[PDB]
């Protein structure tokens with residue numbers, strides 16, 4: 001139970017040839033790089049090369065056999081350690097110190113953390129003059145990104161086909177695609193090493209350098225990040241693609257949905273958050289039927305899952321948890337209104353309920369789809385807003401059950417004002433608050449949006465499904481103040497809402 005490291009490797013390559021007699025060998029990679037660095041040596045002390053490519057294996061290009069591995073490790077690990085002891089130098093386990101390498105109880109915990117490109121980190125790479133254009137006057141994407149060309153029989157820079165490495169490089173090597181693991185370590189590190197030789201600004205090479213939280217906290221962050229130009233649409237028409245050999249059950253039920261891609265791109269931290277496997281349509285996997293590709297997660301799940309950041313409702317659902325929205329949204333139950341489904345589910349202008357059943361939207365070119373979506377977006381209703389506050393009692397006197405205390409002097413319009421203020425400019429609120437009275441329903445729930453809401457006592461206090469009057473006031477009042485972090489009147493200060501008799 002020692003210090004947390006990010007450089008731990010469990011050496012157990014021999015286990016694929018059969019059962020190990022001894023524990024796997026814990027190796028601290030960074031502790032070794034710095035020792036070897038200070039010996040005046042480098043990577044080539046432990047990693048061989050082939051055609052320029054450095055091997056990530058220790059002193060070999062292949063694992064040829066169990067006996068060859070053990071020879072390679074014993075000769076080379078111990079050889080160095082032996083030499084260093086011969087000079088009076090800080091060294092590692094010797095010859096006869098079996099258990100010190102084959103250690104069932106290494107005293108070192110893991111601080112290892114995964115690493116990924118931010119909006120910012122991606123741009124630091126794109127904007128780097130040390131990463132020179134390839135296959136274009138300007139663009140340096142081809143220095144890092146590729147696609148297999150079928151016709152080439154080669155990797156090529158596929159213009160506008162860039163994706164996260166995670167799209168193609170997964171947990172294990174599939175076919176000729178190395179694992180994420182291997183791809184990263186091959187591509188990232190070796191470029192960093194190439195650039196460090198030019199003495200320009202570069203990326204990390206030590207394990208901690210990429211994988212330690214403290215190291216990651218230190219990465220220079222750029223905030224002025226332009227749009228990533230991959231030829232993404234500005235507006236998308238998302239369609240109920242039924243699926244190949246999907247039955248009639250699986251045809252489109254709801255109106256289609258124009259999606260503001262441009263807007264959402266600037267509000268997200270990357271593309272991955274949504275395109276979690278692949279940059280493509282969602283419907284390439286999430287048909288209305290569901291595909292193997294998607295583990296049979298259906299279209300509706302992909303778009304409405306209340307607790308996924310991936311889905312429209314799910315991601316929007318974590319937005320309404322911010323203290324600013326939570327006062328109302330921690331209280332109200334969703335209507336699941338036809339009207340509310342209609343915020344996203346919109347009629348497509350040119351083609352009407354007869355060209356649709358037969359595929360008129362489903363066989364549009366992507367450009368055509370952008371126009372039809374562009375058209376839906378710029379034709380949605382204008383953000384309705386609320387009533388004029390002066391049509392609202394400035395102060396309300398909650399007294400109907402006054403007994404142990406005086407009637408409450410509840411600053412109605414003040415509070416409404418502040419709520420609107422706290423929201424201000426938020427595009428979800430502005431769009432999805434579809435009525436002039438929607439905001440009112442934040443407290444005036446289970447009732448049509450209007451200027452003249454019924455009293456609470458028209459439903460509370462007199463079937464045990466709802467609180468009595470006292471409880472309903474206390475729960476609504478105190479609950480919002482909790483959710484919004486309003487210390488203003490404390491829940492504990494009985495007099496601050498209603499004075500003593």
Ligand code: HEC
Pocket residue numbers: 011012013014015019020021022023024025069070073074077078081092093094095096097098099100101102
């Ligand atoms: C570190 C410097 C080591 C010392 C000291 C000793 N061994 Fe080792 N050994 C080392 C490595 C990195 C490996 C590869 C491990 C793997 O699982 O891939 C090995 C391998 C062995 C094996 C074969 C694997 C197994 O059956 O567990 C054996 C049997 C083995 N080593 C024995 C052994 C003995 C008896 C040692 C003391 C004399 C000894 N090793 C020292 C690294 C190191």
Ligand code: HEC
Pocket residue numbers: 008009011013027029032033036042043044045046047056057058059181185189205
């Ligand atoms: C000997 C003391 C080493 C030196 C010098 C360097 N590395 Fe190394 N590396 C070493 C071992 C024993 C292993 C495990 C693989 C095995 O065959 O036993 C590695 C592995 C790596 C990896 C993969 C890490 C992982 O997925 O766990 C990388 C990315 C790597 N090595 C890079 C690397 C670089 C860039 C070095 C020079 C600066 C370097 N290594 C030196 C042992 C040794």
Ligand code: HEC
Pocket residue numbers: 011025026027028031032035036045046058073076077078080081084090091092093100101
């Ligand atoms: C020189 C080129 C080395 C090679 C090759 C390997 N090791 Fe090493 N090792 C080296 C040094 C200078 C040290 C001491 C580092 C320090 O700062 O004190 C070590 C130490 C170890 C240890 C002990 C780590 C600890 O907890 O204190 C282990 C378990 C170890 N070395 C294992 C190891 C293995 C398995 C190697 C081959 C894959 C190997 N070392 C190579 C120097 C060198």
Ligand code: HEC
Pocket residue numbers: 006007008009029030113114115116180181184185188189203204205206207208209210211
């Ligand atoms: C940044 C340039 C890195 C350096 C330096 C090293 N690694 Fe790494 N590692 C890096 C990436 C981009 C990935 C893919 C997953 C991710 O975090 O984005 C990895 C992966 C690993 C793993 C993955 C194991 C798994 O369960 O998926 C391990 C165990 C690992 N890396 C170890 C490791 C070591 C020991 C390194 C120094 C020799 C090292 N990494 C360098 C990025 C970078």
Ligand code: HEC
Pocket residue numbers: 115116117118122125126131139140141142143144145162163164165166228229230270271272273279
């Ligand atoms: C190497 C230095 C790169 C250059 C030059 C460019 N990109 Fe890149 N990109 C790179 C990596 C290592 C990743 C993986 C990010 C991760 O953490 O998984 C990416 C990712 C992308 C993506 C997917 C976005 C996402 O959400 O991860 C896209 C669409 C992308 N890259 C496009 C792109 C373009 C258009 C570039 C040229 C201007 C470009 N990249 C450069 C590495 C590198």
Ligand code: HEC
Pocket residue numbers: 144145146147148154155162163164165166167168169176177178182183184186187188
């Ligand atoms: C899918 C379209 C891919 C994405 C996204 C990335 N890579 Fe890839 N890579 C892909 C294929 C089909 C192959 C195998 C090519 C073949 O020989 O048939 C590869 C290969 C690599 C390798 C192998 C070593 C090499 O010579 O380049 C590496 C190191 C590699 N890929 C790295 C890599 C990185 C770092 C990526 C993110 C920016 C990445 N690939 C994305 C397909 C795809």
Ligand code: HEC
Pocket residue numbers: 115116121124125128130131143144184187188189191192195201202203204210218219220
């Ligand atoms: C060469 C084409 C590279 C590849 C492939 C990857 N990176 Fe890189 N990286 C490269 C350069 C030229 C720079 C300097 C950028 C600048 O600020 O001018 C960097 C920087 C980083 C950093 C930031 C380090 C810091 O500020 O301390 C990180 C974390 C980093 N690089 C990591 C990284 C990873 C994980 C990569 C593969 C997925 C990767 N880089 C690819 C050059 C190149």
Ligand code: HEC
Pocket residue numbers: 238239240241251252253254255256257288299300303304312313336337340341342343344345
């Ligand atoms: C945006 C935030 C949405 C709201 C609010 C609702 N839906 Fe949705 N839905 C959305 C998208 C982007 C999609 C994929 C495109 C498409 O039009 O299919 C969907 C899809 C569905 C589906 C599956 C397809 C179909 O059967 O036609 C259903 C059944 C569906 N939507 C129903 C639905 C209902 C009942 C809603 C109100 C409660 C509702 N959606 C709201 C995005 C959004």
Ligand code: HEC
Pocket residue numbers: 228230231232233236237238239259261264265268269270271272273274275279280281282283284366
């Ligand atoms: C979630 C908020 C997203 C972010 C961030 C990004 N994209 Fe996206 N994208 C998203 C959806 C819901 C759709 C429509 C999907 C459908 O099934 O029609 C898209 C669409 C695209 C496309 C077009 C795919 C096609 O029609 O063939 C591309 C090329 C695309 N998205 C790329 C992309 C990039 C590069 C992003 C980050 C820079 C990015 N998207 C962000 C959801 C989200």
Ligand code: HEC
Pocket residue numbers: 274275276277278280281282283284285286293294295297301302303305308310311312
């Ligand atoms: C096929 C390659 C896919 C594409 C294209 C998209 N997603 Fe996906 N989806 C896919 C898989 C393999 C899974 C299950 C395993 C997993 O990745 O978690 C899913 C599941 C979802 C879910 C389920 C909710 C959850 O548990 O996270 C959602 C909300 C989802 N997918 C959303 C989504 C969106 C909006 C996409 C377009 C940008 C999208 N996925 C693309 C496979 C695939």
Ligand code: HEC
Pocket residue numbers: 316317319320324325326327328329332333334335336337340419420422423424426428429432433438439440441442443
């Ligand atoms: C009380 C005064 C509210 C505040 C503050 C915010 N919202 Fe709200 N919102 C309120 C009501 C009474 C309703 C109707 C609920 C229904 O299901 O019909 C809404 C509706 C929304 C919705 C649509 C449905 C849903 O996802 O719950 C969204 C997306 C929404 N509101 C977003 C939102 C955000 C982001 C807010 C913070 C800035 C916010 N609202 C404040 C009442 C109130």
Ligand code: HEC
Pocket residue numbers: 386387392393396398399412415416419437439440441442443444450451452453454455456457
């Ligand atoms: C919670 C923070 C509220 C918001 C937002 C709005 N109102 Fe309200 N209002 C609220 C309470 C707790 C009460 C007292 C009702 C009771 O039964 O004791 C009221 C009162 C009114 C009234 C007068 C009630 C009556 O006696 O008829 C009206 C006309 C009224 N509220 C309207 C109204 C409108 C139009 C709102 C949206 C702008 C609105 N209120 C917001 C709590 C909250």
Ligand code: HEC
Pocket residue numbers: 331333443444445446447454455456457458459460465466467471472473475476
């Ligand atoms: C009838 C039309 C009602 C009016 C006017 C008000 N409430 Fe209500 N309330 C009503 C029902 C049917 C329910 C249960 C179902 C639901 O939609 O929540 C409630 C619930 C509450 C609760 C508890 C919510 C919980 O999560 O447990 C509270 C605290 C509450 N109501 C308070 C309240 C207040 C202060 C009102 C005046 C503005 C009010 N309700 C009006 C029915 C009706």
Ligand code: HEC
Pocket residue numbers: 398399400401402403404405406407408470473474477478489490491492493494495496497498
């Ligand atoms: C504002 C956020 C409040 C705080 C803090 C407390 N209560 Fe309250 N309570 C509140 C309202 C709006 C009402 C309805 C008042 C009315 O006369 O219509 C109440 C009601 C009561 C009642 C019943 C009415 C009465 O007996 O006068 C009791 C007994 C009561 N409240 C007790 C009470 C105590 C002990 C509190 C502090 C611990 C307390 N309330 C805080 C709103 C708010």
